[PDB]
Design an enzyme around this catalytic site. Sequence first.
Site, PDB file in Angstrom:
ATOM      1  N   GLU A  55      91.656  40.640  47.474  1.00 22.81           N
ATOM      2  CA  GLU A  55      92.030  40.278  48.810  1.00 22.81           C
ATOM      3  C   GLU A  55      93.455  39.894  48.914  1.00 22.81           C
ATOM      4  O   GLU A  55      93.981  39.980  49.996  1.00 22.81           O
ATOM      5  CB  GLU A  55      91.206  39.077  49.261  1.00 22.81           C
ATOM      6  N   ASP A  89      94.360  42.925  58.719  1.00 24.04           N
ATOM      7  CA  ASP A  89      93.326  43.598  57.885  1.00 24.04           C
ATOM      8  C   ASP A  89      93.777  45.007  57.665  1.00 24.04           C
ATOM      9  O   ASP A  89      94.515  45.576  58.507  1.00 24.04           O
ATOM     10  CB  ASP A  89      92.030  43.969  58.762  1.00 24.04           C
TER      11      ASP A  89
END
Length: 164
Positions: free
Chosen positions: A11, A20
């Site tokens: 991540e 994102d």
Amino acid sequence: MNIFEMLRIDEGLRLKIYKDTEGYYTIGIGHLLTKSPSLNAAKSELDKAIGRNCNGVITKDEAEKLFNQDVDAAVRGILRNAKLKPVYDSLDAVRRCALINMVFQMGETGVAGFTNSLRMLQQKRWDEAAVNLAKSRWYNQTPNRAKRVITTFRTGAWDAYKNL
């Protein structure tokens, strides 16, 4: 290697509101804030999440706090889910981390939709399940990450994450 280290490789860490792979407003270690297009809606969600006026920016500390909550909730959601629990229980420790990683990225609901691959993992048909998991939006959209997760389920070891 453990769940926290694994996820943090996948991540990353960003202390400023960001988008994102999906275009969504996120912060920290993959903590999604809103699926809404306004920076403003995200800022508000952010302050609500931290309990302060953040102005779009958090500390390392705050990021890791969010991360601990997210991990905890992912596991708890698996345990609470009728479709996930039985697969989770059936797996060894390393593979368990690969299921937790999918839940974290995609939500309980999204993973509970991979019916056929779940079935294969329960049966411990590792190579078949790896070929089935690859046939998904998930793999096509974030292939390098999907392939790390996939090798993890295939092998039952941490090699995909050794490189990284």
